[PDB]
């Protein structure tokens, strides 16, 4: 076996398991899901003795997994290498937990002002906290100044990037926070109007938006004198955002 050497022996047979997903979503202003999918991978930090035989199972709540691209050791069952390695990549598109709901509200004031209001609605267990929340609201190219106040977090107008950045430390599920802006516009040519860019989001949530959960991870070493009841197994679900936009 060319991915694992013989004779490995650890004292504390531990097992770290990270489930890493990236939720992608495009949503109309009215809340209709235009396109959405999750891209995920499962990495395993293995510290087991000898040449163990491992069986990884899950709910395949339920979830269907569209694509699969496995490591070279599998057949699920596998002899895992020593250390950190990627066990599998996957992608689902059905029954995806959308962790946040961006609700834009833009109101023209003649041809000079732009009163804008954006509401975030967290949509998960209130016992869990989302972290590293960023909401990017793009401003028109003909902006002289913006005026924003917000309840939770802090907001700044990065005029160079031509957008408003709103950052929130944490936010529990089943909650809502809002931000309100006044945008002063220079006069310009009404001709082109402007291509309304979407409102982007970035967050971290301690669960798999695909609903995936680890049913079992069995370890089997027949030669050595340890069984699966002796393995200190851990699992860590982390979901990041990728392309998370709402048409405004």
């Amino acid at each position: 076996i060319g991915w694992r050497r013989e004779g490995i022996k650890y004292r504390r047979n531990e097992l770290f398991l990270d489930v890493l997903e990236s939720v992608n979503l495009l949503m109309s202003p009215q809340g209709q899901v235009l396109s959405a999918h999750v891209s995920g991978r499962v990495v395993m930090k293995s510290y087991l003795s000898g040449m163990p035989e491992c069986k990884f199972g899950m709910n395949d709540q339920s979830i269907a997994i569209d694509d699969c691209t496995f490591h070279q050791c599998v057949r699920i069952s596998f002899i895992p290498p020593d250390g950190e390695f990627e066990l599998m990549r996957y992608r689902t598109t059905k029954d995806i937990i959308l962790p946040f709901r961006v609700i834009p509200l833009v109101r023209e004031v003649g041809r000079t002002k732009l009163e804008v209001k954006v509401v975030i609605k967290s949509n998960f267990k209130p016992s869990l906290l989302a972290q590293k929340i960023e909401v990017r609201i793009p401003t028109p190219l003909n902006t002289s100044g913006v005026q924003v106040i917000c309840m939770k977090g802090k907001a700044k107008y990065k005029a160079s990037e031509n957008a408003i950045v709103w950052k929130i430390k944490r936010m529990a599920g089943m909650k809502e926070s809002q931000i309100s802006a006044e945008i002063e516009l220079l006069p310009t040519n009404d001709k082109k109007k402007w291509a309304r860019p979407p409102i982007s989001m970035n967050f971290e949530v301690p669960f798999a938006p695909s609903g995936l959960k680890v049913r079992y991870l069995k370890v089997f070493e027949p030669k050595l004198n340890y069984s699966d009841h002796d393995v200190i197994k851990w699992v860590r679900y982390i979901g990041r955002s990728g392309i998370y936009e709402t048409r405004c």
Binding site: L15, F16, L17, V214, L217, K233, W234, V235, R236
Partner: peptide, 6 residues
Amino acid sequence: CYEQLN
């Protein structure tokens, strides 16, 4: 950080 597998 991590949680134990039940």
